[PDB]
Amino acid sequence: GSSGSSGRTRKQVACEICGKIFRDVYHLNRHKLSHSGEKPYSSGPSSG
Ligand SMILES: [Zn+2]
Protein backbone atom coordinates (compact mmCIF):
# COMPACT_ATOMS: atom_id res chain seq x y z
CA GLY A 1 0.00 0.00 0.00
CA SER A 2 2.11 2.87 -1.32
CA SER A 3 2.35 5.14 -4.36
CA GLY A 4 6.12 5.34 -4.67
CA SER A 5 6.44 8.73 -6.36
CA SER A 6 7.46 11.40 -3.86
CA GLY A 7 9.47 11.18 -0.65
CA ARG A 8 12.54 12.30 1.28
CA THR A 9 15.55 11.97 -1.02
CA ARG A 10 18.75 10.85 0.69
CA LYS A 11 21.43 13.45 -0.05
CA GLN A 12 23.12 13.68 3.35
CA VAL A 13 24.88 11.62 6.01
CA ALA A 14 23.36 10.26 9.22
CA CYS A 15 25.38 8.66 12.02
CA GLU A 16 23.44 5.71 13.44
CA ILE A 17 26.11 4.97 16.05
CA CYS A 18 25.16 8.00 18.14
CA GLY A 19 22.29 9.39 16.09
CA LYS A 20 23.25 12.62 14.34
CA ILE A 21 23.02 14.31 10.94
CA PHE A 22 25.79 15.72 8.75
CA ARG A 23 26.27 17.36 5.36
CA ASP A 24 28.65 14.91 3.69
CA VAL A 25 31.01 12.05 4.54
CA TYR A 26 33.84 14.59 4.63
CA HIS A 27 32.36 15.78 7.92
CA LEU A 28 31.50 12.33 9.26
CA ASN A 29 35.12 11.28 8.76
CA ARG A 30 36.23 13.61 11.55
CA HIS A 31 33.25 12.56 13.66
CA LYS A 32 34.07 8.86 13.37
CA LEU A 33 37.15 9.66 15.46
CA SER A 34 34.99 9.95 18.58
CA HIS A 35 33.67 6.48 17.79
CA SER A 36 35.52 3.18 17.40
CA GLY A 37 37.25 2.07 14.21
CA GLU A 38 36.88 -1.68 14.67
CA LYS A 39 33.80 -3.35 16.14
CA PRO A 40 34.31 -7.13 15.77
CA TYR A 41 31.25 -9.12 16.83
CA SER A 42 33.25 -11.61 18.90
CA SER A 43 30.27 -12.11 21.20
CA GLY A 44 28.37 -14.32 18.78
CA PRO A 45 29.97 -17.56 17.53
CA SER A 46 28.44 -19.37 14.56
CA SER A 47 26.32 -22.50 14.98
CA GLY A 48 24.47 -25.25 13.13
ZN1 LIG B 1 28.34 9.34 15.71
Please write down the HEC assignment for all residues of 4-39.
CCCCCCCCCEEECCCCEEECCHHHHHHHHHHCCCCC
**Residue 7 Ramachandran class (φ > 0 left, ψ -120 to 50 alpha, else beta):** left
Experimental method: NMR
* In contact, 18 and 32? CB cutoff 8 Å: no
Pick one of 3.40.1000.10, 3.30.420.40, 3.20.20.140, 3.30.160.60 as the CATH number of 11-48: 3.30.160.60
Cα 14 from chain centroid (whole Å): 6
d(CA 35, ligand 1 centre) in Å: 6
d(CA 18, ligand 1 centre) in Å: 4
How far is the CA of 23 from the CAs of 11, 15, 20, 27, in angstroms? 8, 11, 11, 7
d(CA 17, ligand 1 centre) in Å: 5
User: Could you give phi then psi for residue 32, rounded to 5 degrees?
Assistant: -55, -25
Return the half-sphere exposure (C-beta side, CA atoms, 13 A cut-off) of residue 16: 0
Q: CA angle, 27 as apex, 21 and 33 as ends, to 5°?
A: 95
Output Rg (C-alpha) for the chain, integer angstroms.
Answer: 17
